[PDB]
Design a protein around this ligand. Sequence first.
Ligand SMILES: [Fe+3]
Lengths: 77, 105, 162, 218, 544
Amino acid sequence: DNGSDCTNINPFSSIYSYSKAKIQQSINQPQGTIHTLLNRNKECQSLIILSAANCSRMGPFKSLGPLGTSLPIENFY
Amino acid sequence: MRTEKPLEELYNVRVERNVTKDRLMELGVPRWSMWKTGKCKLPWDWHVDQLVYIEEGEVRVVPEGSQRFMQFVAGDLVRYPKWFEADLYFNDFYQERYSFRAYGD
Amino acid sequence: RQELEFLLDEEHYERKRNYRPQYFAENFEQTKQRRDYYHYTPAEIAPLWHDGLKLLFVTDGTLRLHYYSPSFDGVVVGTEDVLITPFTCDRTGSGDAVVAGIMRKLTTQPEMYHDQDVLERQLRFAIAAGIISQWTIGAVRGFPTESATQNLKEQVYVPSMW
Amino acid sequence: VFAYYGLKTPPYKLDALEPYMSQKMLEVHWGEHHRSYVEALNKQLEKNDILYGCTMEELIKVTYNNGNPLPEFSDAAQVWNHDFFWESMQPGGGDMPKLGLLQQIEKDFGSFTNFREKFTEAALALFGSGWIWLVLKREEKRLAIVKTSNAVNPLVWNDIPLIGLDLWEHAYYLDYKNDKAKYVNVFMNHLVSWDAALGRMARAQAFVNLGEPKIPVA
Amino acid sequence: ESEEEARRKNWVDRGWAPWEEILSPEANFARKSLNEGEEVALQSPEAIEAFKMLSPNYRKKKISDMGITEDEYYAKQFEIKGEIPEPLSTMWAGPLVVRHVPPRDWPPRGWEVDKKELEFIRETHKLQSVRVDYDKVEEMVKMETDDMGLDRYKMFLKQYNEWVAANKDRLEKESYKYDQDYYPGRRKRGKDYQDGMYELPFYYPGQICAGKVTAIHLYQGAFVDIGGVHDGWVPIKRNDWYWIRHHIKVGMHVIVEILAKRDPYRFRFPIEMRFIDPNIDHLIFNRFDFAPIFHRDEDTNLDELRRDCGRQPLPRKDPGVKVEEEPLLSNHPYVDKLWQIHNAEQMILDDMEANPVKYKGKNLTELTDDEDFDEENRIEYSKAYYKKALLPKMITKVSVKELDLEAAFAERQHHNKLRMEAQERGEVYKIPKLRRNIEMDEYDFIHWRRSLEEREAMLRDISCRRALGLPLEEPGRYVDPSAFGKDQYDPDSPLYRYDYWGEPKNSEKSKQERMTDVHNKSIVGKGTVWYEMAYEDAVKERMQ
Ligand SMILES: [Fe+3]
């Protein structure tokens, strides 16, 4: 009767290969940056999901590269 | 992803393919134990190392909660790590030569 | 709208209406997560234009009426308040009233071709007619009159609109 | 083929510590014991190219593998370990710490005499070969004295080391046959380097802040 | 506690910071007017000033009274109050002597090059162990060029140039496929990509690089452009930007040191660096414990993600049992698969012996029982079986393709011929064992020997690890004995279950009655049991 166990699909069958495309990219997740709480560190730590619905952007508002690697120094003192 | 991170090194399962017999007799492969099984499923949790020298068939190892497996042809020497939780899926006749080794050789 | 998308491209617009910004909201109005009333640019309708064409209407249906002329574009806003009468709540004929209102205003007002404000003030009439035509079971049974549509236009919009 | 292929000669000469550690003994420890380690580390890195392109501090942690060390962990750890040791000793002697390190020792271990007592106790309490370390814990922001196994270094627990001693016998057998407490006392009295420890603590202060913030009045 | 102590605590743990909070005039008047009272005359000077500043002409006259431009007032609105720190100075320790060394991890996974060139390139790693005396450096300064030896480095460059021209399009396609929106730290694409940018393999931890600050995030940190396709990240948390913002500004040319390089697929910021020229190591108190990662849709197993990123394992409940103080395992997985086919072969042989008409006319070597056998439909479960009680049932479609009836036929035809003559001899014959049972016993024996060898190795492994100071159990998995908590506990003492109150030992449901009924029906009599022993003891007494 239990059918929710999709993970029990034999990898040798074509159904396992078809499930990769049948199951689209999961978007049920809140899709945001996980922002931890420093104040809630002592108690049960909670999480704030910052996403596009909480942040906005203000449009108008109106050489370079590696030099080298330091060599070891003889006079470590 | 174009995976350049295989499960043989993600999980520390060192596999030597097409091993030469001189190193085998140097380790002591023929003077080991035996294990035979057909088509079965063996959930096993490791407590020590295990040098498996497969002899006859094929074994597909599936770690816990994973959907990708690693395949071992009949000519490989596999070293299963400690604290490994997997599900060995067998399909046909299988024989091996194992020797559990503690910390050190 | 569905016909225009089916003619131009269906999957393209279906993917555009599901852009899903992940880091920030660029337009500063996508944070509210409202419906997508996409105004098609005049370059997207270019493969459908010709010399003899005078006006075009996208007609989302009692909500938005995108009008395209060879000199200007625009959009009018609607109401869609069919939930005020749940027991009748029949929208069998709604585009017919809009087309009738557009034809009436075109036959009466000749300035709708070379003016943008007049065009909006006249399309609000068709919008009001289509809104009234959804509160009666049956298309021929619930077609409104001119006085009722003008009353709805004066009661919904602000005096500066009409 | 080989990275880290260098004995990394100590800052001082092999005869700089002659009154306390004979020039022969140093020659053996550095010349033979250490050199060998490097050679084997190069031979092991030639085989595995994935672990070749990794820094020392990262190679040690990736070869420790959280309790189940890879076959090349012991060797690389030793090479690093030895390097730290040579530099953890200076020509002349070490009398007392300086401005910052002495204050931190007084704050953590109470006093410098208690610190020396605990260091000697931890050095003599170790059994077998191993190393003793004076490290700086990140999450705790304090100095601690940890004793480890044969080749394990405090880099496996994300702790910055400052001073280390080799308790492996190879180090002391030639001049101090079996008086290991003597060897410790000599290393703590006339062979400890506090300038190097202070410099390493200054370097570590870029990763762990030892101080109090400036709180505005608002 | 005291106000000062409280503010200190907040700064240390919660992260309070007295920000500017730029306000409107209408609000400034509200904040500076509600302090006096209500419908009362405004006596404070700042309240009267805020009341007068509610008129636009008053503000446009006051801005001209002090002689400030229209933009000057708007710039002065967004001004940082409080004590401003002193301008920091750059005190260089000593000469900087460097040397261009190719990265140790230059060849990516999947790119094959000639071995001799890679050997000559890697040869330079040996020369890095030599020491240089910094003080005498000035003495050996040579201004004449065209004498420097950089063949190795040049060789690296040659290889690099090839690799970028080989894989630029592939990297750009992957960036467009896996990354949707651009963010500081991702691959520069589209109009932001100019030819000549150093790609990610070029860099390596330990290199000092000069760049400019192009982004400043409150929660993440600063972002420095080092002239490459991927930006650099300096971790600065939320609360430190109250003092660091006076020393780090967008567009400032800074000198940084790369300390780690990571994979851009998993990690958000592949290059993390520290500041050298604007040394601010005395103002960073909050730090990142683990590098940020991407929780994508492809990774479904959390263990693979944990092993790829390098974080601790997922904690589990702490088992009270010991791995050494527990019995062995003596059950082989093939036992069931061999038992079922053995019973099937026995039943088929019995059915063929019962009805010889069906067995006649067909060769016993090959018997085609069913030609519609399917491996996919071999497992059939039907819960409709209610012959004795409502319970589920399963059906197994055994295939006769692998049934070894060859030896079974001979064994049965040899055993029945002897049991019949034993019955005729006035004796009862009980067959001790069969070949299939012997094979199952051999499988059980080899599995038991495997388990015995495993525990024999474990008994030595525990000892040595304990002796040398190594963890016996994986650190980070069984750390919490019962920190995970508040679960209903069956036990009464936790109070998650009832305990007698005023002698309330009564228990809801838990009817022993239903059980009593099945016992009572069969054996109602409350007689005293005479013989009582286990089934194994019964077999022992029977065989004895
Ligand atoms: Fe040593």
